[PDB]
């Protein structure tokens, strides 16, 4: 089902790990058998004659028992160690083979499969899910088997050693079963309700953080923060219920558990008075069933973890066995070896699976003779790069055919097909290696003569003899240490060391100077001698050296010919002619709530009670042994009635104090979670638009920040305080009594307590070291994989997946060696742990026999001390591992404490800055030099000047995104210019009160949004800080020509346009934006492309409404419709961020 990828050695590993899992699991019950016999000899000899001052038989028997104990210790040492290692070794080996095969089948996975899903989903899937499988199949299975072992061994040693008492005990089990089971049903249902309610109230942060920009313009912080608080104050009503219910149930569980104790002790006191089951054989059944219970109880999550393992492994195996359409790895392909450069098309239709609601191919009918060069032209929006992608078959068209010499496209072995052609594209990307190595990846095996000859001939050798480390410089992440035009020249050097039979040239000459373009042109010209080359047209001044020239109008051969053949042919060509996360303290995570100190006080007093409950049961147990020495029945049985009651009194008091500690800290936690949620959100909204425009602080990650990390902080705040308090009581009076009683046994056993305790600590230290080194090696290989999940299309183009596969393996072999070290590191301390629990028995009891014989302390005292300390430490272990992960919520608190203090340079809350009373919309730019500090390499504005007068207009004509949106921003003061100044109304906008400035600049951006409110609530969002009269809405509702169609709707001002409001068109929700900008009576507009969904009339009506109040107040317009540009007051062009 899941262990396929297994050699034999894996199976031997697992099986020789399982048998010794069981032979470790069976190691306590045997221990209790011997404990029974030894306490029998002790109390027999003691009562039958106490000797505080012929007894050496006691010693003979106790040394015999010491051999038994330790010999048993050795047994568990070996079996523990082997269980751990062999299980985690089988884990490591199989997981390394898994990773490797998963990549090698993600590269074989087509681009349609890449068009479907996400590209961080994949890499995160890789990293996390492989760790998930690793921990799943890894070792939890070993521990689970030893759990079931100790269980069945506990019950069997019961029935074998005394059956009446075992039946008494095992009889009332089904009541504890019913109890903790309904505990589970209660708590689970309540968790579900709580989480569903939150995530119903956390889609608000995700719809007002997916759109940070429109908010931060229109001045919509506080409207949002309040849309959030209003929901957290719904969820508290269910938080509280869950608190009281879960903690009542927990108290019940302990009342019943202590009730069970009383029953058994009283019964198996009548059945010892009758001289039937002696103390030695009477304590055996008791403790063995106790151990059975505790182990089999404390290993449930080792089933949830296996379930996670399967749950992950499903999709991973689903992919490795997956097998695509035309395979990038199958050598099953009828590759010719000699062939012309014929490329004949016909009636090819092809649509996209990811985009099928727009026909992109419409039937192409072209011929390419062998060698003759056709040059392709066309306007913006037809799919040139698309067609190139097709030609090489990254897809399969619908109802047409391409061929080379009529030979089918389903013939060419894909390695042949994409190693025979070559393409330089818009931005051929460079991977993270040398120059010589990119070029070697050009083909794989070339010559240095080819190298320099291409390099030179590729117009691109001077910088090499200029570059630092001339031959081998490192073009790192996305070509930052370069010019522009060097990158296309180096791509051409790569593509020329390939010697293709068909060449493709796309927008590779966009930021060059003419001469280098002409060089590479003539170079590929003097290279084409029997082959074809297709080029996509940037400037129609160089196309002239073609055999034939082609244009497109919707994907069909529309205009075909040479220069003069088309110059009078009048189609399309003619019209185209002219991470520190600074650590935090503890004190700080606490100071995060010194406004619920009453709860902490109740809960920690109550906690110290609850936790100082063992030293009770130590002294109780001491007294039980004490009463059974001399033998006067009459008063014995009355004492034992007393002690059954005492257990009963502790069963009630335990209930109350458990329920308090639980409920109190539940309250404190819930409160602090609501406060940290609110505070962090409110702090998110107050950050300048850089921080949000990062690849790290996305909407996914921020929404996770809110919805889990807030929750997790409570771990480190409250529970860790309760837990320190508990263990201090659980093991402080332990040692205090045990010093009043054992002057010298106590020291000796204190000298072993740290091992049982610091299994976890030594493992945390060393496992943390190796987990760091691992995650580093994993992040190396993750780099190597992020590459071909980002730069996929290129890599399959060069067909050079198969080089990445081996490059990947080379690193994958890192973490596997990591695991093989972790095996031994983990196992030797685990075994000393489990191993050293027995050697303590041996030492302590043998030493106590020494003293008792010499006469230093009654046997009741050696049993006290030993129980108070050893069952002390063993209880400490379980307590601690009940907490929530403190390592994982002292970082979470760090990740919110860095989001709190981070001071934005543009404070969107500040109450300072020159407020101008009345505002004349005279906008001015002074050689503003601009670049996004995100991709900080291309200066978007290279010194720009613009100046508009009141009531007037500007309008920036040109090409798509040329540097035409950034102007829209540097007034809303999202970003600040790298250089340049935009002084407004005569004065410098780097001095105004930013909260004020955006209150005058109404904007209809390229893509208006409608929130999750009713329409009334939505437009009157157009102004905040003063509630909107219902007629104000209605007034603009007639202004932007929208009041009529409203009267058709169910709830005129009250219908709900949902999340994105899928109930709507493009021309109406765009129209609402005009309704929206106009309630503010905005001084200057910025009508960025309002008509990309505006129909004729919808715009042709509203332009009358756009301008009429725009009269007497400026506007910048950056759109694409000439018939608005013409009537404008002024004129500007933008070429590569420059005016001309």
């Amino acid at each position, epitope marked *: 089902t899941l262990f396929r990828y297994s050699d034999w050695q894996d199976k031997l590993f697992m099986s020789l790990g399982t048998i010794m899992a069981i032979a470790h699991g069976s190691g306590l019950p045997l221990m209790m058998i011997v404990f029974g016999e030894m306490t029998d000899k002790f109390v027999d000899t003691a009562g039958n004659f106490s000797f505080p001052v012929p007894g050496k038989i006691l010693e003979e028997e106790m040394t015999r028992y010491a051999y038994y104990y330790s010999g048993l210790g050795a047994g568990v040492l070996v079996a523990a160690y082997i269980q751990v290692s062999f299980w985690t070794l089988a884990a490591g080996r199989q997981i390394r083979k898994i990773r490797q095969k998963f990549f090698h089948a993600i590269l074989r996975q087509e681009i349609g499969w890449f068009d479907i899903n996400d590209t961080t989903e994949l890499n995160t899937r890789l990293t996390d899910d492989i760790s998930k499988i690793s921990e799943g199949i890894g070792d939890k299975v070993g521990m689970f088997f030893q759990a079931v072992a100790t269980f069945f061994a506990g019950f069997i040693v019961g029935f074998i050693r005394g059956w009446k008492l075992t039946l008494v005990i095992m009889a009332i089990s089904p009541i504890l079963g019913l109890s903790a089971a309904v505990w589970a049903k209660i708590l689970s249902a309540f968790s579900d309700k709580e989480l569903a309610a939150y995530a119903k109230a956390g889609a608000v942060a995700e719809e007002a953080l997916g759109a940070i920009r429109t908010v931060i313009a229109f001045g919509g912080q506080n409207k949002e923060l309040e849309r959030y608080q209003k929901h957290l104050e719904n969820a508290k009503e269910i938080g509280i219920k869950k608190a009281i219910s879960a903690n009542i149930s927990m108290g019940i569980a302990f009342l019943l558990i202590y009730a069970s104790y009383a029953l058994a002790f009283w019964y198996g006191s009548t059945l010892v008075i009758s001289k039937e089951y002696t103390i030695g054989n009477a304590m055996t059944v008791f403790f063995s069933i106790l151990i059975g219970a505790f182990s089999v109880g404390q290993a449930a999550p080792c089933i949830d973890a296996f379930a996670n393992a399967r749950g992950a492994a499903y999709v991973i195996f689903d992919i490795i066995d997956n097998n695509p359409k035309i395979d990038s790895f199958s050598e099953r392909g009828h590759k010719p070896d000699s062939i012309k450069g014929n490329l004949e098309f016909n009636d090819v239709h092809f649509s996209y699976p990811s985009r099928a609601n727009v026909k992109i191919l419409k039937g192409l009918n072209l011929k390419v003779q062998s060698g003759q060069t056709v040059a392709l032209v066309g306007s913006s929006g037809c799919g040139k790069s698309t067609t190139v992608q097709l030609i090489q078959r990254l897809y399969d068209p619908d109802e047409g055919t391409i061929n080379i010499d009529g030979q089918d496209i389903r013939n060419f072995n894909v390695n042949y097909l994409r190693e025979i052609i070559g393409v330089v594209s818009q931005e051929p990307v460079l991977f993270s290696t040398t120059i010589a190595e990119n070029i070697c990846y050009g083909r794989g095996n070339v010559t240095m003569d080819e190298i320099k000859k291409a390099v030179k001939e590729a117009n691109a050798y001077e910088f090499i003899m200029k570059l630092p480390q001339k031959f081998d410089t490192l073009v790192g992440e996305r070509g930052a240490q370069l010019s522009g035009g060097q990158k296309q020249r180096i791509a051409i050097a790569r593509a020329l060391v390939r010697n293709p039979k068909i060449l493709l040239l796309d927008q590779a000459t966009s930021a060059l100077d003419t001469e280098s373009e002409a060089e590479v042109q003539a170079a590929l010209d003097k290279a084409r001698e029997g082959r074809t080359t297709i080029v996509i047209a940037h400037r129609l001044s160089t196309v002239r050296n073609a055999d034939v020239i082609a244009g497109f109008e919707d994907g069909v051969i529309v205009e075909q010919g040479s220069h003069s053949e088309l110059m009078k042919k009048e189609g399309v060509y003619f019209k185209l002619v002219n991470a*520190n996360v*600074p*650590p*935090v*303290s503890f*004190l*700080k995570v606490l*100071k995060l709530n010194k406004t619920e100190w009453p709860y902490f006080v109740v809960g920690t007093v109550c906690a110290i009670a609850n936790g100082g409950l063992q030293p009770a049961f130590s002294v109780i147990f001491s007294e039980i042994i004490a009463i059974f020495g001399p033998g006067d029945d009459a008063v014995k049985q009355q004492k034992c009635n007393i002690f059954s009651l005492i257990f009963l009194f502790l069963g009630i008091i335990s209930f109350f104090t458990f329920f308090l500690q639980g409920f109190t800290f539940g309250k404190a936690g819930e409160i602090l979670t609501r406060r940290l949620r609110s505070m962090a959100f409110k702090a998110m909204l107050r950050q300048d638009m850089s921080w949000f425009d990062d690849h790290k602080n996305s909407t996914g990650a921020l929404s996770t920040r809110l919805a889990t990390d807030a929750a997790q902080v409570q771990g480190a705040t409250g529970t860790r305080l309760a837990l320190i308090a508990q263990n201090i009581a659980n093991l402080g009076t332990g040692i205090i009594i045990s010093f009043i009683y054992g002057w010298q046994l106590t020291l000796l056993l204190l000298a072993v307590v740290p091992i049982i305790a610091v299994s976890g600590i030594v493992e945390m230290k060393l496992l943390a070291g190796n987990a760091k080194r691992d995650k580093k090696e994993l992040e190396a290989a993750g780099k190597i994989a992020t590459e071909a999940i980002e730069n996929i299309r290129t890599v399959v183009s060069l067909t050079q997946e198969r080089k990445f596969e081996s490059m990947y393996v080379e690193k994958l072999y890192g973490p596997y060696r990591n695991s093989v070290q972790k095996a031994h590191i983990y196992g030797i301390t685990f075994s000393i742990s489990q191993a050293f629990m027995y050697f303590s028995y041996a030492g302590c009891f043998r030493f106590g026999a020494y003293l008792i014989v010499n006469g230093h302390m009654r046997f009741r005292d050696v049993i006290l001390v030993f129980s108070a300390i050893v069952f002390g430490a063993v209880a400490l272990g379980h307590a601690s591992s009940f907490a929530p992960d403190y390592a994982k919520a002292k970082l979470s608190a760090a990740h919110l404490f*860095m989001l709190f*203090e*981070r*001071q934005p340079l543009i404070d969107s809350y500040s109450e*300072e800055g020159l407020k101008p009373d009345k505002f004349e919309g005279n906008i001015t730019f002074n050689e503003v030099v601009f670049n996004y500090p995100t991709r900080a390499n291309v200066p978007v504005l290279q010194g720009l000047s613009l100046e508009v007068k009141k009531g007037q207009t500007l309008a920036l004509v040109g090409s798509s995104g040329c540097g035409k949106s950034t102007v829209v921003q540097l007034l809303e003061r999202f970003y600040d210019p790298l250089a340049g100044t935009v002084l407004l109304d005569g004065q410098e906008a780097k001095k105004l009160n930013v909260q004020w400035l955006r209150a005058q600049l109404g904007i209809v951006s390229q893509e208006p949004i409608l929130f999750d409110c009713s329409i009334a609530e939505n437009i009157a969002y157009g102004d905040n800080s003063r509630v909107v009269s219902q007629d104000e809405i209605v007034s603009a509702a007639k202004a932007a020509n929208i009041h009529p169609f409203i009267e058709t709707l169910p709830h005129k001002y009250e219908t709900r346009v949902g999340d994105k409001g899928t109930q709507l068109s493009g021309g109406q929700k765009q129209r609402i934006a005009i309704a929206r900008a106009l309630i503010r009576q905005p001084q200057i507009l910025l009508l960025d492309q309002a008509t990309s969904a505006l129909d004729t009339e919808s715009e042709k009506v509203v332009q009358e409404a756009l301008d009429k109040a725009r009269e007497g107040r400026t506007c910048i317009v950056i759109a694409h419709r000439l018939s608005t540009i013409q009537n404008a007051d002024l004129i500007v062009v933008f070429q590569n961020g420059r005016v001309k």
Partner: antibody
Framework: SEVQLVESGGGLVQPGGSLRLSCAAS????????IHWVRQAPGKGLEWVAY????????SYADSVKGRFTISADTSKNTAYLQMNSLRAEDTAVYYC???????????????????????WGQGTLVTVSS | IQMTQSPSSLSASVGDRVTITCRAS??????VAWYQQKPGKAPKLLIY???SLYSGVPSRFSGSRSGTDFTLTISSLQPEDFATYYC?????????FGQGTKVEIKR
């Protein structure tokens, strides 16, 4: 590197004004040690003003400024702000930043906050309070 | 928590025993310091805790404690001296630099 504390801001205000003085450290991590704000009188003497420790979240002002000034310590870019409100005429002094000492070398503990002295300083920005 | 550099504005000549007393408030208890500042430029740290020098500092400067009568004394007086020294004390969230002294050359 070598310990390099610089300042910023400051340069003009009248009585009844705000200001922000930004002490940017360079050469060490901020949250490892304490940070103070001395104020050198124009010609008279040298008087402490405040401090903040960003690893136990503990701030503390001298009397003459309490409630009015606010410190903060942005550990996303190694910066220590001091925001000032309602400046009088007895505050035209110059305002050096400073870093209190640590003995261990790479962090400072809570016990004896800055009782070993202040070692590294910046060069003061001069501020004024004239009408 | 008040500090008094008692012999303000000293007047000693080059090559002599030179003294400074900086009597504190009650019980700072060895947590005082001694800073020497040349005019206009930031103050230096000279010695701390009243006994033990900093780094890079010459070994001609003596720090002495007695109860709460402190003392910073000199005998070398290389003319790189002649500035103003301030003996800050630091205790319980309250730090006070006291009003220091100076050293005038003789003529």
């Amino acid at each position: 590197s070598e310990v390099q504390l610089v300042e910023s801001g400051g340069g003009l205000v009248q009585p009844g004004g705000s200001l922000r003085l930004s002490c940017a450290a360079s050469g060490f991590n901020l949250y490892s040690s304490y940070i103070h704000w001395v104020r050198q009188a124009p010609g008279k003497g040298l008087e402490w003003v405040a401090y903040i420790s960003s690893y136990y979240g503990s701030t503390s002002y001298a009397d003459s400024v309490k409630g009015r000034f606010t410190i903060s310590a942005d550990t996303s870019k190694n910066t220590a702000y001091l925001q000032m409100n309602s400046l009088r005429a007895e505050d035209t002094a110059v305002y050096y930043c400073a870093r209190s000492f640590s003995i261990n070398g790479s962090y400072s503990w809570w016990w004896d906050q800055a009782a070993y002295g202040l070692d590294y300083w910046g060069q003061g920005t001069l501020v004024t309070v004239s009408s | 928590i008040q500090m008094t550099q008692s012999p303000s504005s000293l007047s000693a000549s080059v090559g002599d025993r030179v003294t400074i007393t900086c009597r504190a408030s009650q019980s700072v208890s060895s947590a005082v310091a001694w800073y020497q500042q040349k005019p206009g430029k930031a103050p230096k740290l000279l010695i701390y805790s009243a006994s033990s020098l900093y780094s890079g500092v010459p070994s001609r400067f003596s720090g002495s404690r007695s109860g709460t009568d402190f003392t910073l004394t000199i005998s070398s007086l290389q003319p790189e001296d002649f500035a103003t020294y301030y003996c800050q004390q630091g205790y319980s969230k309250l730090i006070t630099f006291g009003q220091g002294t100076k050293v005038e050359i003789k003529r």
